Amino acid sequence: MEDLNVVDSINGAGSWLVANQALLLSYAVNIVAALAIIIVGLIIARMISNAVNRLMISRKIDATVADFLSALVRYGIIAFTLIAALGRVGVQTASVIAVLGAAGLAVGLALQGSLSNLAAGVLLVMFRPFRAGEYVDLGGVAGTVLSVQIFSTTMRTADGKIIVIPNGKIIAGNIINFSREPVRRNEFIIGVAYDSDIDQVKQILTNIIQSEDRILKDREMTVRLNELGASSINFVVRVWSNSGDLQNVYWDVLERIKREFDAAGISFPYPQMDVNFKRV
Amino acid sequence: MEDLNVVDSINGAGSWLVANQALLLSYAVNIVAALAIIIVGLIIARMISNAVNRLMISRKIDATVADFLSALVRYGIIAFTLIAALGRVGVQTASVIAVLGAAGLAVGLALQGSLSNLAAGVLLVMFRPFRAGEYVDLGGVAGTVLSVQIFSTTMRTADGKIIVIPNGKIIAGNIINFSREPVRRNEFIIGVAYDSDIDQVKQILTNIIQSEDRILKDREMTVRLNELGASSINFVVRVWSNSGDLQNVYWDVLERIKREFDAAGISFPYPQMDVNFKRV
Amino acid sequence: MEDLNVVDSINGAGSWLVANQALLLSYAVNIVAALAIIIVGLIIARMISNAVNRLMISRKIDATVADFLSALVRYGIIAFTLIAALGRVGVQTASVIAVLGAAGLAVGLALQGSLSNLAAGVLLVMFRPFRAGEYVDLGGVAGTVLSVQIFSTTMRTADGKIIVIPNGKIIAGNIINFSREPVRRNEFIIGVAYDSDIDQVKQILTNIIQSEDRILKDREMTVRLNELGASSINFVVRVWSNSGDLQNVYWDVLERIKREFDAAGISFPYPQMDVNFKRV
Amino acid sequence: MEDLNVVDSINGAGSWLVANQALLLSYAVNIVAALAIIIVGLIIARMISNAVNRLMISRKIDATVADFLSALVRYGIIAFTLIAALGRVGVQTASVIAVLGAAGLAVGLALQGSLSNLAAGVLLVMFRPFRAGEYVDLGGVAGTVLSVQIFSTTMRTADGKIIVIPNGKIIAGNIINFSREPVRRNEFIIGVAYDSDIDQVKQILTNIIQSEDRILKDREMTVRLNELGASSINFVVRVWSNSGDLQNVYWDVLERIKREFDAAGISFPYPQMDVNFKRV
């Protein structure tokens, strides 16, 4: 062979070229493939890193982070190409794979919580437990909805204050809808002197509630002496009425009661402390 | 060989074609297989991405998310095909596998909590601890059930307000059924002047409870002086009666008591503060 | 060879059939094995998906979920067969393996909590800390046991209300048994005027407890002035008696005491507020 | 060759038997080895599944769970044998490995908490912070030990009520030993009229504590006016004495004090509310 007398000495006279052509050429094929892969990945990364910016800038963005992210991802893709080259030549990169995988796991964990809100949003969207037009509470947070979307929900307070809350939080909690039900019960409590007649007061109260229309006479209308306290005996009342008027009626009756009790001669006592007196 | 004098020079005269036909053809078989795999996966992904939409739109859906998800999954399947190609040509994609696996782990973690509710629902369904017709409490949340399903349960409040709660939450908590048991005990407490006779009051109370039918005379009927306070000595009473009438009887007895005590001459005192008086 | 002049042209005249028969046949063996595996797995999955239903329907089930689960698992098994085929032809499915493994991890995490209750149940069963016939508390939840099983335990309340609680929860908590011990101590507190004689009261109390049989005279019977308050001086008492009668005796003594104190001339004072008086 | 003219046609006349005997026989060796492995594993699993029962039934067990577990583990071992067979023939089972590994991870997580108690038990055993004969508190749970073992510890309450608590819980908490120390301090508080002489009271108290033997005169004996309140001025006292008698002495001194103060003419006042009076 011309291999090892022109470009090399006659090393053992053991001409390797024709004997091991495939072997010696395997390295070369590996090498060429590698470098080609490299350059193509490079140009691709450049193009794409600018292209994503091209597409995103139309949408709402910030420039600094846009640039930072595009450049960083570009660099990472590059790294990918590199490891592939190393693998082709026959180097052990499993360690590199391991470390980068650990990094991916760590970042996934870091963002997990945020991601959960995404999940929550999707879920509630398909389920539609409540809608923006509706008025509800999400647990300690009452007020009307304004909008609901990607990661957070937007609702207004009775005072008007706007509040925002993440989706992941709310789904975990319990939920209450008032809009979905038209009618609701109402409750009242009263306290009076022990002497006073329970029957008189009872029928009085009755006459009042009779007087009202908005009440649901169909539905029950309970009036009892609930329980006994230390200062006053305490009555309870129950009614049903449409959600819309619930508050108003709630106020109205109370005024009525006050007027009617004084007319009746009844009284609501003050805290009563009894004493025994001795001089010393 | 005709290999390296027509399409190539006489490179070492070492005709490789017949010598390494299998070797040189291995690349080609890899290549063709790869590209074929690619295109088939592509058309499949297209078809399926539209087909899932076809099937789902019949069901309740939102268009934006439907499109988003279908397109995204389509793209992902595509990616799968790509990596397979790279593998056939003989590139090291283990890093890619690692990163995508980390991503899958992260997303699974993010949605884990939601998924738990699914599990809870299935479990309770087969176990059937409670049923929609029944009235129960799930811990701080009393009211009647309305429905129970995929991830959440629906029940009504005594006031009527509708509430919803995730399944995963409830299973963790303790559970209480009232429907399942027909009868329940009841309790009462009373407070009186120290002077008053305990025997008189005792037999009085007794006579009352005797008077009632709904009480379970079979079952015990305890009446004791529970303990002594700072203002009044305090009695306790116990009874049993069917769940349905429990509340009513509870009210009835109290009225009786009030009437009977005044007849007896007994009195419930007010808070009593004793004093010693000196002028200065 | 007849290979490449009948079914093919004379491509390099390099007849491959006899030269590479094993090689060219390897693909075929792979292929046939694959498809065979496929079909067998398919029929198996069909049979088994119906068979599990056959077996389970005898037991308590719901039809919708039964069908859903059987079909889903059927489909999954199918998928298994598919990947095996792909592997035989020589495709890289490690990515698929990775993603499905991530999914399995996620679901395991989701159900982990529920599973913990299983573990708890098994544990308590072999340990037998308490038994259904017995009466205990599990921390804030007192009442008698009714039954204990797979994931949850069932006990009754003193009021009769039935309650259910998951096994995983209880094992974590502390546990208290009353049935296992026959006898228990009891405690009492008293408050009196500062003027009153401690020795008189002491011997009185003593005489009372002497009067009782159910008390364990063998065991200690402590009677001290525990400590001094702002309104009265406060005594304490201790006794021992069998669990069964514990409550009754507890009540009995108190009645005795009241009677005996008035006979003694002692008194339990009311809250005493001293004053100094000046006119302005 | 006799291969492909007797049992087969003259397919390409390319007699494969002698040419590829090793190759064609490799399949067979794989196959035979596989099936043999299968059957042996089967019989082994049967024997062992019954053998474990044989051994365990001697110990405390429940039959249902014993059977369930033995059968389940038997089945699992079987599955192992199966996958090995599949591997020998040359099928890709890595997916199966992955899923079963995910399952193992999930179950380990589920039982982790329980297992922690095991760890705790071992630890405390070698460390021996406290012993069964001793009396201690583990944080909110005071009472004497009864026994300590595998996963839980057993102690008695002062009232006698038996309580059980898991080992994992306690090790986490703080721990307090009374037995290990023979002597302890004691504290007292007092409140008196502002007018009264502090020196008189001081020396009085002193004389008392002098009177006692059980007190450790060697150790300090502090007596100060701790601080000033709104109703009275408040004294503090400190002493040391052996654990055993600690309670008794604590009571004794108090009686002494009461007697001695009345003799002294001192008094403990009641809550004093001053007033200004005007008529309207």
Next chain:
Amino acid sequence: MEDLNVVDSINGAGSWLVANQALLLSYAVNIVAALAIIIVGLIIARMISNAVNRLMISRKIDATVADFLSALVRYGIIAFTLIAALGRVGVQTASVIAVLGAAGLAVGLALQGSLSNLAAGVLLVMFRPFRAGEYVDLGGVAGTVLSVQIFSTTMRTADGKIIVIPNGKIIAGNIINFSREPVRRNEFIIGVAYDSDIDQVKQILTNIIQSEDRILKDREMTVRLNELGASSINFVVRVWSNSGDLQNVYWDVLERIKREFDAAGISFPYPQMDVNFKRV
């Protein structure tokens, strides 16, 4: 061959050189490649470890940690090169890979929480729920924003005190914006003698609110007797007005009220305790 008679004895006369040239040379190629890789990685690490410092020192830094980190990362890169060498010679380093991967996982977990704040910052930035110029509360922390960035946010307190809070914390919480809404409601409560006329007071209050301009007459203006207390009957009032003036008006009205009530003859009573008097 000249192999084993010059440099070695005639070991079995089985000249290995020409027979196994490729085999024996494989080791050598491995070896040379390895060492070359080593040295290049070394020089690279040196250069880069200094280069990063060169670049970072321009930015705000601390020298000690800068040096520490640069040196440590340098060393780690070195380690990478080493394992690659070991792999080429044909040693099993999978254990090393495993341990270092476990370490990476641990560190990722340790820093996860901090990293979460990064995520939060990015998210809020693109979402822009609130802006620095605006005044808001983040839950228990009210005050005006100053700046928001990488991991933390900076806002000022009403008192002026500067406060800082991590981003990860806030995103989790609920959020409230006042700037975004121009107008808000306001509330008031009042308490008066039971005797006093509700109509008189009502119209008075009305006249006041009429008097004000800043109030939104368009919007509702509620005036009711909210509920009844133990000492005074209690009124409520509601209004709407721009955020900017909200506080001022809130104060103004109150002054008005005080003046007007005394003019009216109304009075706000003090806590009223009723008594019954007996001498003993």
Next chain:
Amino acid sequence: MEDLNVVDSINGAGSWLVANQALLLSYAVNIVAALAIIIVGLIIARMISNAVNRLMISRKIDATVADFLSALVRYGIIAFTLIAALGRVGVQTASVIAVLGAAGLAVGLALQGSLSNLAAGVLLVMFRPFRAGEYVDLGGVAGTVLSVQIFSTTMRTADGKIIVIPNGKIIAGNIINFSREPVRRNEFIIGVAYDSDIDQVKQILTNIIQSEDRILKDREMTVRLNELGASSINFVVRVWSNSGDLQNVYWDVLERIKREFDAAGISFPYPQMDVNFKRV
């Protein structure tokens, strides 16, 4: 060949021995190596399982757990040897590896918490924030140190009660050292009649603190009227003094004050409730 006419028939006359000697012998080498590995591992495990006991029994141990652990680890090592054998013959044990790895992960998780205390101990040891001779608090747990070691720390209470707390717990918490600082401030509060002269009292207090030596006149000595209270006006005082005498001086001054105030004619009032009186 003599292979298949003596010990076998003339199967295809295709004598395999000389043709495939290496192949057929590979199995044998695998087999012999395997069994040898087995037996050696066995004897090793026996020896070592007894040897560890030999070494440990000298140290403090319990016999039951010693035996249990030694036997269990012995068995596990055995298992290792087994899997290696299976691997040599050419069986797929990756599943076994997976399951045992899952088990190791689970146990590591279970013991993690305990292990954390180890870490804490090491850390504090090198850091030496506090030392046994010193007196400190670790958050809600004040008292003097006794000893600190492997997993827990030991300190004494002021009352003398011994307490133990795990290391992992404390490091998490905040830490407070009193020994490390020689001097500390002190605070006092007072309340008096509004009429009384602030200047007189001020100079009085001043004269007192002047009277004391132990006070650090160098350091500030603040005396102000902190705030005006409800029943009385309230003064504050500040001083500095060595830790050792801090308590004593704190008491001393108070006595002084009491004496001096009565001399001054000042008084500390009682809670003052004003009234308005009307007969009905």
Next chain:
Amino acid sequence: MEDLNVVDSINGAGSWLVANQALLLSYAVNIVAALAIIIVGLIIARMISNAVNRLMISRKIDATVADFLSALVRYGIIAFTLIAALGRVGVQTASVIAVLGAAGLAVGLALQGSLSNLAAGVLLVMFRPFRAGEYVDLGGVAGTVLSVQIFSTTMRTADGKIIVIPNGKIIAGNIINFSREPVRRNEFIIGVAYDSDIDQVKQILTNIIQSEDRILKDREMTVRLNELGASSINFVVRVWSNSGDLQNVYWDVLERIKREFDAAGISFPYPQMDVNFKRV
């Protein structure tokens, strides 16, 4: 061949040496390489285990743990060498790798929390939110900084007590700086008789604040009647002034006020309880 007639019988006459020289020599090369690796690793571990001690002892250390750690790490490195040997001979050690990796994961988890403090320290160092010279609070822990470093931070209390807190804890919390801002607002509250003139008091207060210089007349100076209270009507005041003098001025004004009010004839009332009197 001389192989199997001198050192062995004529086994099948199938001389293996020259036929399979490479094969039979492969074992040997594996073996020699292995043992060499072993011994070198051993000597290295010895040297290094002593060398680390040599280097560390200069720094602050404890001997027992130093020795323990050095020996343990030495042993572990040894183990590494061992597994490599086993791998070369061709044994399956993947199980060993798995278990040791699980152990590494467990230990990383155990120390994770501690490590987090490291991260926190680094972060705060580069960010420099606060500096040692400055005075701040970290949430419930106010006092001046002393030093900040590796894992913990050191600050002094107003009382002087030294406190230490881990870095990981603080970063999580919210942070407050007083040093960074020069000026701060101040607040005051007052309560007076309802009769008293608001205008008089208002202008009085005004005159006072006018009197002061340190106040920022530029900045607002609010004086309103905040709200009407129960026993008294309650005023509020606001001011701004430099941090340094904030406390002093805060005290000064109060003294002024007291003096000026008595001069004005105003009074701060005591709690006023009204009564109604009847004899029985």
